[PDB]
Amino acid sequence: DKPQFPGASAEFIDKLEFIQPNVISGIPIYRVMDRQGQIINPSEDPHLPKEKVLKLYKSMTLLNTMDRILYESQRQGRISFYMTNYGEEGTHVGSAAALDNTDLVFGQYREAGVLMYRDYPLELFMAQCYGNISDLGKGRQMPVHYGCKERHFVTISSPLATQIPQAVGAAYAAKRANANRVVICYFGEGAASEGDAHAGFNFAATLECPIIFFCRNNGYAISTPTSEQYRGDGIAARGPGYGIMSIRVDGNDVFAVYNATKEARRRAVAENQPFLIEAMTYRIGHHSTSDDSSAYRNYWDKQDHPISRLRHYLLSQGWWDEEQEKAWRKQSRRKVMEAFEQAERKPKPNPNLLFSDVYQEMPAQLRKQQESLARHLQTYGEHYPLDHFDK
Amino acid sequence: DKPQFPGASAEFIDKLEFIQPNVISGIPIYRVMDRQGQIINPSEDPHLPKEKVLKLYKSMTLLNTMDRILYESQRQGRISFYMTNYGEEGTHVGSAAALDNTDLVFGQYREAGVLMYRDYPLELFMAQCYGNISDLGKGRQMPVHYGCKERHFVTISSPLATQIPQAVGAAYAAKRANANRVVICYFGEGAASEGDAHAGFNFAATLECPIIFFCRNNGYAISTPTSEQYRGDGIAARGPGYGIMSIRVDGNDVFAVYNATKEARRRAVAENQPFLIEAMTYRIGHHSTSDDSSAYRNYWDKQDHPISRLRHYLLSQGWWDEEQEKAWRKQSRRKVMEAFEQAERKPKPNPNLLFSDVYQEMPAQLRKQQESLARHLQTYGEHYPLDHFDK
Amino acid sequence: AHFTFQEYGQTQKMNLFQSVTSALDNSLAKDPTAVIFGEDVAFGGVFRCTVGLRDKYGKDRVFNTPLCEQGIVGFGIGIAVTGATAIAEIQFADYIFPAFDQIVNEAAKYRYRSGDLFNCGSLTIRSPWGCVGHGALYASQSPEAFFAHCPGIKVVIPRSPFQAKGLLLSCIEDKNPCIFFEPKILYRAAAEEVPIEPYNIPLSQAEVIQEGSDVTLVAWGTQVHVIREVASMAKEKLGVSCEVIDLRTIIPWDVDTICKSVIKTGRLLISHEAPLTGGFASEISSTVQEECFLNLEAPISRVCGYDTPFPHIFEPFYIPDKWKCYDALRKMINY
Amino acid sequence: AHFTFQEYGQTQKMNLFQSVTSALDNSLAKDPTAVIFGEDVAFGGVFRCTVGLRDKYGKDRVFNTPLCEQGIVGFGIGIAVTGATAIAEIQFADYIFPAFDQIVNEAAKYRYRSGDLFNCGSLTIRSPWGCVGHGALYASQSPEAFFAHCPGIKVVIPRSPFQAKGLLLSCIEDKNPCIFFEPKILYRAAAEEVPIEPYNIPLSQAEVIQEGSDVTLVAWGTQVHVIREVASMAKEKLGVSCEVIDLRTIIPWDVDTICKSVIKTGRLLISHEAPLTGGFASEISSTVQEECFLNLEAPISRVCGYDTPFPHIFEPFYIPDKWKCYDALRKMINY
Numbered sequence A, B: 001d002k003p004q005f006p007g008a009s010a011e012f013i014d015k016l017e018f019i020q021p022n023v024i025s026g027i028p029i030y031r032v033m034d035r036q037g038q039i040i041n042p043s044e045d046p047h048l049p050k051e052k053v054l055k056l057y058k059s060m061t062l063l064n065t066m067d068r069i070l071y072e073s074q075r076q077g078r079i080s081f082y083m084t085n086y087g088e089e090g091t092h093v094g095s096a097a098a099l100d101n102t103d104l105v106f107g108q109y110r111e112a113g114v115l116m117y118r119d120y121p122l123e124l125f126m127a128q129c130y131g132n133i134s135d136l137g138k139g140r141q142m143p144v145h146y147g148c149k150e151r152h153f154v155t156i157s158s159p160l161a162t163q164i165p166q167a168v169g170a171a172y173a174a175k176r177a178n179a180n181r182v183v184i185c186y187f188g189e190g191a192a193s194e195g196d197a198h199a200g201f202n203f204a205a206t207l208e209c210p211i212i213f214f215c216r217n218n219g220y221a222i223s224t225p226t227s228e229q230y231r232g233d234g235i236a237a238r239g240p241g242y243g244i245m246s247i248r249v250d251g252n253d254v255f256a257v258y259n260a261t262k263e264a265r266r267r268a269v270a271e272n273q274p275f276l277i278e279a280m281t282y283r284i285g286h287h288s289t290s291d292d293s294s295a296y297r298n299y300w301d302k303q304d305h306p307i308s309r310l311r312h313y314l315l316s317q318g319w320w321d322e323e324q325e326k327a328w329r330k331q332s333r334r335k336v337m338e339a340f341e342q343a344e345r346k347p348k349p350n351p352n353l354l355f356s357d358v359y360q361e362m363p364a365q366l367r368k369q370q371e372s373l374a375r376h377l378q379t380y381g382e383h384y385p386l387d388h389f390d391k
Numbered sequence C, D: 001a002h003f004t005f006q007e008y009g010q011t012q013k014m015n016l017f018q019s020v021t022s023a024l025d026n027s028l029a030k031d032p033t034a035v036i037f038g039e040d041v042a043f044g045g046v047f048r049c050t051v052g053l054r055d056k057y058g059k060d061r062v063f064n065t066p067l068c069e070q071g072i073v074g075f076g077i078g079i080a081v082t083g084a085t086a087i088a089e090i091q092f093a094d095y096i097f098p099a100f101d102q103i104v105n106e107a108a109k110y111r112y113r114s115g116d117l118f119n120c121g122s123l124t125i126r127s128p129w130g131c132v133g134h135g136a137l138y139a140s141q142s143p144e145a146f147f148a149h150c151p152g153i154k155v156v157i158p159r160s161p162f163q164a165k166g167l168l169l170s171c172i173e174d175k176n177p178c179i180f181f182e183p184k185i186l187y188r189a190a191a192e193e194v195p196i197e198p199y200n201i202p203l204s205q206a207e208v209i210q211e212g213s214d215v216t217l218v219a220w221g222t223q224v225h226v227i228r229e230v231a232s233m234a235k236e237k238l239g240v241s242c243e244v245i246d247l248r249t250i251i252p253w254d255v256d257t258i259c260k261s262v263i264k265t266g267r268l269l270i271s272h273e274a275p276l277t278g279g280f281a282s283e284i285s286s287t288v289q290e291e292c293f294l295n296l297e298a299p300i301s302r303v304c305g306y307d308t309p310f311p312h313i314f315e316p317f318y319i320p321d322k323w324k325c326y327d328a329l330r331k332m333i334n335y
Ligand SMILES: Cc1ncc(C[n+]2csc(CCOP(=O)(O)OP(=O)(O)O)c2C)c(N)n1
Pocket: A110, A158, A159, A160, A187, A188, A189, A190, A191, A192, A216, A218, A220, A221, A222, A283, A287, D039, D067, D069, D091, D095, D098
């Protein structure tokens, strides 16, 4: 006898046996170089040219330099909010480096390194955090909600996981247009608990979309450890359930991250099929500036750091030295401080920008609200911070 | 070197390898008796006493008799809507029989057999479809949205999958009260695509709840085949991803359904752990009375039917015969026609019941709306079907 | 039957569901990027609105999605973000809530928050709407007011086959995410002449379907047919001249047309199937009161569904039928 | 600072977040079934509202859930269905939308649709609410109007630490699913004397905090502090006597108190942070117009946030501050 059910393809079994989840021994973690920067398996070595590996190193450390500066700025109340990328710099640059420049990116908020690798100007990162006249976002969103149409980085929004099924629709449209394009979608392990993640993963598989799902599993969603987030073998183990090709990689190894991403882009585009990459990492800094992470929890910053590990790699190749490290540290700092000071000195956008872009055109009833404000300021203007805004 | 990541428990791997989903050869289908009613493996035989197996048979056929009658009624516009249980009678009685009478049940709309097995009166099934004065639901919901506080069957609602995370909360409260109680939650393979399914499965595992998830996979969600519903190995394969003990059973074999349910209740209650049972079946009749299933698609009704299969089983045991079949068919029909005629003749509830139970108490502004209607009817009453409603 | 139903080249008799199919057909025909998707649209949809479209335009343009509303809208926003036209279907307006977050926090704010670097303007969401005599709680809802409070989206509701096709083609072509509610009770009842080629009806424009001088009656969807009859009752039994207006677009709404009408009549009655508290009639009422205070001769009247869920067997007593609207009109005319 | 803040046994100085903790503490102490859950509540919550509760009552009563709002509400409804008290937390009111379906289609209709065979009355959902000076689009929202259109639920918003604790204890004890919005800007600003033992403040009752005779000013949450100051400005600069009312309960709302006040003053100004179109001020306005038509001396005034998403850098120009309310009051007083 052979099973005839339309919902599944299987054989009958005659004994009652529950399928047990494999958690103690989960999906292994793909690694390319050890914690001392040594390649473990010559056949997995990407052999990236020197210029590209240096670009990886400089993008990571530059991001790091910007994070320190902007984090202090927030502490001083110069900007109202901030979120660093400590410990996850490798997942950003390694995956971005594996993409084509026109692959469309959807993210969460801890992916600024993708933009950095894509040469997003320091002046724009800061324009957005200060909400000044140079922000193409027109100062409307909270700091670190970056976006760039020119570098194919969809504007970041606060609601967790909403970008996931959006990314899938974007990939579906990409498939129809027949471009050699893949869409990549980043999100944390906490965000993976939202209903939208389940929606996106399932639509991606059943609608056959060229998309790479990229989960950064850093062990925490603010104060919640993964033991309270899920009970299966992480995020990677859910991919096959949706019929999605999956893999887990050491998120502190830019080369393992790069190899996995490069291979998933290649197959996703050719086979119009989704791939799931779960990068194991560790959140070094606080969740944000409104969180003191030492309320619910040094090994990961001193003995297993993506920047530190790529550094050892460069040394062994004769590609970097203590002197170059010093010069780059100094130049990084200067570049960041130049952009920072220019950003603080620029005025904020014209208060009228509060009314545009709600709809493409501006509805008549909305223009009347705009005129209302203009009249209000004519009369009570002395009570508003008018001198700081553009006119 | 050993992986130190908090999000997973695994070993490193040195070669890049994507995890491939096993779909061609999925989770096997647990079966206890063949299509001719013969026990396949003596050690899996439940050895249920005769009275209980007959109760199973009579509940299934009785449901079937009620379905035929109510389906015609709908065709004649006597009731406004209806949904039959053809082909899924076995998943209902087999699972209900395995539960304790006080285990709380959450369902979708194709589970009337659970109530039937729980001796829900024919008069009440019909009171609800007619929305007459005997309906404890007070005629407020569409036909077949059954509910019974006394038989622990939570009132059915139309929005798919919402009952899933609800069932989990109910199981969590059950765990705290320390009752020897499990909660069971039924839903179709289509409903399993909603965000709420992902929410319920995950909360159940991480919050350690005594709950049995019961998915009826009948191959279609209205006109959508499973090929367009998911791409993984059905629903069963998603359970382990959430760290949930799972199994697949032949939904047309009441004994396989019963054994799986009995064993899951036993462990769910003792270990405060969720279980996932996916029953493979086939939707024999139309999706509902507003659907003509022969627009998007006889093997399952004549060569693999739960009622037919239990019948052969009874014959081989000397427990049933053609004569008894005839007498039961006649008595079934009579019982159903008696309840049906009493139901059609009862008047509908008092129009005032339209305002109660919105809140426990009735807000003053709501009572004013009630008085408004009462005055309106004083004057324009001749234009409303007042003679059909209770006073 | 709680209601009674009643230039552009060659026309053809079409009921409401057929006029939707005609609009979708014209759109796909003239927009290579346009795709249609949702639960069960491949075989033609549970209300037959997509019959024949998949065979004519291909399975990659007219397809079924998995059963997940938040997914359908998120997926649609994604397609629109690349500039392609996305027409998503939500099977019953009652089931649009699971996608509420994608609609209010995402679609509506997509252009604003990005400084117009990105948008999902080419997105349209169509969904059956309104009572149908026996739909009870989840097959009868009128959720327009929940969306009226959301800056960034448009909500449009037609009253007939001709209006539906023209309003839908504008929604599909508008550069803002749109929600189009189709009165399901009219799908097969309402039948009239409809241009077979494309035409548009503008958004945010109410339509005065009958001029009057004593009172202004405003409604939308099926309810426009109810007040039309109420206007006839008023004339026959009270010698009252009614000005009947179809709002058509919930937001942004045609404030001017309504005010201009009330400035002339001086009396206003607004009617809708949805529950009174928080329904859109409140917005219309408080606004008219602010623009026409000096012209108002009597308090503005709102004849709506009661503040309870939509009932099964009690439907006939729940809806704001012609007798209920007539009575309120009567009392208001006598203020 | 766009605003300035200002019997039951032993009291203690508490800011708003502390008074919430005190209420949750009294509830768990007197209700063995009561549990508290949501994202990050175990270590005390991102606004410190649950500090110490897990250590005092146990991990099975005060625990973290996975990051999924629709799950949190569905889970809560389940607990309530068995009769146990469920206090769910949604981290920011901005993130309540993913649970909209569970709230509107499920929680609100649970008792009605079942004929009272089942209910989820012992469910309470608390969530930070309102602007905070720099929260932009998703850390500033005031979603009360979206819920005002939903028969079956209660929506309650306090203006201070004393009001918060008493209103929350009533929500937790009410036999109807309740949504309690906590003005996050007051969590650490507003500090006053608060009974350490349990007491209740009734739902659906507005509170006249200052008697007046020329105008009635209505608001809720932080905005009550704004109109209090506006009342002071009116007196000092216009010789105008203002009657200041805190609505407290959005639905079912205290219609009587507001009308009685407007019958006396004859003028009304309603103010709220949320966007004007579809905001709750519409419901209040159209209702007053219907009950007090003959007493109204001028059009009812609504001073609200503009019909746009909530902005980051432009916040100061967006909110309906005291100068905006004052000006509208001025013009209305001069009608
Ligand atoms: C729908 C929604 N719910 C809650 C929040 C509040 N929130 C912001 S970040 C966060 C933690 C997310 O954790 P994770 O996805 O693991 O990313 P990580 O910050 O660790 O990179 C939460 C709960 C939100 N922004 N959106």
